[PDB]
Amino acid sequence: DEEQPMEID
Amino acid sequence: TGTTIKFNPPTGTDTMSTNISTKHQCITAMKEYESKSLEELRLEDYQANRK
Amino acid sequence: NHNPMKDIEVTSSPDDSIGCLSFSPPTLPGNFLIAGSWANDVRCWEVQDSGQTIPKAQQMHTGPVLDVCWSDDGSKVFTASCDKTAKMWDLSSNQAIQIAQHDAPVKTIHWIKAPNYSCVMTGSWDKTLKFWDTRSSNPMMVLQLPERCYCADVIYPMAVVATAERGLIVYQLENQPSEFRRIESPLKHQHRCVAIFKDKQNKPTGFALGSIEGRVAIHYINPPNPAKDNFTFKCHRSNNTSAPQDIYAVNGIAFHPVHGTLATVGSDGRFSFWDKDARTKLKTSEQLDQPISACCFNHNGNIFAYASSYDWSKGHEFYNPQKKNYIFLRNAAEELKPR
């Protein structure tokens, strides 16, 4: 799949 | 003991800066259940035959 | 629909929801998979390089099996159950004996191979962490936990235990198990899964921790700038839509043994692959018609096993004994290679 940035707190 | 109380997802808020509204789709997020674990509740249901 | 990823199904899968998975060590030739279920059984399949599964043996507890693990030589399988006991299961003879007893269900079981000792560690809802030599009925060591044990992991020389009420403790294991540090937990809601990860030299260096609120924490034991080097990230959520976001529980976390990347499986019925150094999401599966209850890797990281099972995330009313459970196998070595 498609590498994406993480949603970091 | 057990999950006799109906499941009702708690409402909350998170950020994505703008807040967004959220639903906690896990029973132990409820106040009636927050002091027990998923497995703990399930065993309690099994021992009472609430399947 | 049941298998949206078109992955391989383990034939003769458990009758009830699957609680735990475990692959054989590298000291065993080939690959053997163990699963405990809520029908009180422990089962063992041989996975074959072609992908075919062969059921090899089954043992029995008197209550649901919550955890399983192997011994370093791959000769014994250890099982932990809600009947408040844990068993040692000799595969060649197919006999199993009791080696541990608690006052509450036994949530976690791990094998410690230290240069100078070997034992089984059990973590239980009776708020104790106990270690057994598998010969004596008396535990070799007993430590008190801050509340009920919810999940744990071991990679010598380190152990991590997470409990109810955000209890989080790291253990040092050299010579004799001892409490190393009580961590002020980075998560604010129920702890659910923990997995230890190693540094560039195969040295255990920190852990990943999953809560019920769609969050995983990355925690280094001793980093140079903990404010920036430790972090949490959101996962197993819904979503272009203003409808409220649906937050599911993180059910399992496992690290790929060679790439150092990680997998998480969730009550949302998906698995996601992650690179915690690049802080990126590598893949997310399609949705399965029920939660993913557990996951794990084989010894060389060429089989990703995940279990499709209800997890009681919505209580008793959403349980369908009618509905089948599966264990799926996926080759995700290339999928989990960084960059």
Numbering used by the authors:
A (entry chain X): 53 to 61
B (entry chain B): 158 to 173, 179 to 213
C (entry chain A): 25 to 263, 266 to 365
Text of the article:
SARS-CoV-2 Orf6 antagonizes host interferon signaling by inhibition of mRNA nuclear export through its interactions with the ribonucleic acid export 1 (Rae1)–nucleoporin 98 (Nup98) complex. Rae1 is a messenger RNA transport factor that can anchor to the Gle2-binding sequence (GLEBS) motif of Nup98 (Nup98GLEBS) at the nuclear pore complex (NPC). We determined the crystal structures of both SARS-CoV-2 and SARS-CoV-1 Orf6 C-termini in complex with the Rae1–Nup98 heterodimer. In each structure, SARS-CoV Orf6 occupies the same potential mRNA-binding groove of the Rae1–Nup98 complex, comparable to the previously reported structures of other viral proteins complexed with Rae1-Nup98, indicating that the Rae1–Nup98 complex is a common target for different viruses to impair the nuclear export pathway.
